[PDB]
Symmetry: C3
């Protein structure tokens, strides 16, 4: 479906931006920024692929995905190399990626089996997995532990995808509703200071 | 066998307690405590499943296992939310899990192949793997490095399972002897201050 | 081919030395030193095997590989237990391993598929993966982030293996040229202070 394909690109771009921003804040230079953005963008899909027995992983064979990760990370580096003082919305980029991958990752797991536990947990791991790798490599406690509603919101997003698909909702709509609920939940938590 | 099934539940409960305790000590709140307990309880089995080519992992498809991880972590949070000053035996919970999973993890590897190296190493990775993930997420040097006899004791436990099975020992007995040797070795190291 | 087999042993020895050195510097004792050397030596091959769908991993079934990792780590511990003040060339050992595994890891991926992205990225992950695990376990930002030209040099080494193989270069020669370019690139970066 077109929405599934689009969400893959949105998630790759968003997580690449979040990883490249993290590296910029850490003081890394161009190539180190590319490494962290590339890893954050593709890590969730790779981990998800391994859990589902899909080898080699799509992110390592389908050329547009790693090319998109590379270009997004490079664009982020160049942007903040010029505009050093403008805001760096790491959590906003991460949140958009969380919604794109909780939905598309739940979709991939649901195609493997109708098991609600597999769909909800693999979907959530797809969503958070790139940011977990980013935080581990950065040598800091990850968001899934420091942000009280973060991992659960990914779980909720993959669960609403499962429920929608279970009710025969068309795949394009089930993905959009899952993405929107995940993103909205994150915006409320961030804007209403639920995690403080 | 009944002992294999029982050891799976014992290991899941024990490692969930150890992960939830770690999160409580870190100052996390309810949902963060659940995340760390869930991850510690199921991580070793997932890693073991991937190494042996078993996908999707049993911990993500067999409902009682993640349900047990969730309930054990929730019980731990509620207990220490009320009884804030009572002792938190993280290492004791981890040690019981180490014995339950070194034995059952060696059993799973032995069913795949009679290779002593595969059985001993995959068994040890099953045993320590959940606590390694816990310590990495907590952003601290893991027990497998800070505790001089920890990883080796898991190796010894999986090796005694291999030897017992190689001698035709019934599976229920081979699991019990492996579990007991692992746990006893850990109790001696902790009580006799071997790791100081 | 003979060069592929030799490079496996060179990489295992080199990364075992680098991991055992890291543990010695961290103040670990004998068994902890063995754990970190063993993990660094075998982690890249295990990760590479999982990405390519090769289970159980060769490093866990082919006896000479983990035996070599163990003996190399033990030799490193004994050496620095006696000669406490002599230099500890962690980065030099890591660099030799990087060249041995970028080449041999690219070779393994190329046997699975002619996809330049798969060959270059899996090759680079094979090369850096053991040192990434070492640095994560040591609880420090890994070399792939702190050393500006490190990860890219592994990528270049696996890419020159791909180009050589694509041009019909004999496998023994393609491995040697890949190894030499990776190692030389690392020597220049270290000696010419490119990463400062
Ligand atoms: Mg860390």
């Amino acid at each position: 479906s077109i929405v599934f394909d689009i969400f893959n690109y949105i998630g790759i771009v968003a997580f690449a931006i979040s990883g490249a921003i993290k590296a910029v804040k850490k003081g890394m230079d161009l190539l180190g920024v590319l490494v962290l953005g590339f890893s954050t963008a593709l890590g969730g899909g790779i981990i998800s692929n391994l859990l589902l027995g899909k080898t080699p992983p799509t992110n390592l064979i389908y050329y547009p995905y790693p090319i998109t990760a590379f270009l997004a990370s490079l664009a982020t580096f160049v942007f903040y190399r010029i505009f050093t003082n403008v805001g760096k919305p790491l959590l906003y980029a991460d949140a958009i990626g969380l919604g794109a991958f909780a939905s598309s990752g739940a979709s991939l797991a649901y195609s493997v089996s109708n098991n609600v536990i597999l769909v909800v947990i693999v979907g959530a791991i797809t969503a958070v997995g790139g940011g977990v790798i980013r935080d581990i490599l950065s040598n800091e406690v990850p968001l899934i532990l420091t942000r009280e509603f973060y991992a659960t919101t990914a779980v909720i997003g993959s669960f609403v995808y499962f429920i929608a698909s279970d009710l025969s909702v068309p795949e394009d709509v089930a993905l959009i509703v899952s993405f929107l609920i995940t993103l909205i939940l994150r915006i409320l938590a961030m804007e209403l200071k639920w995690e403080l």
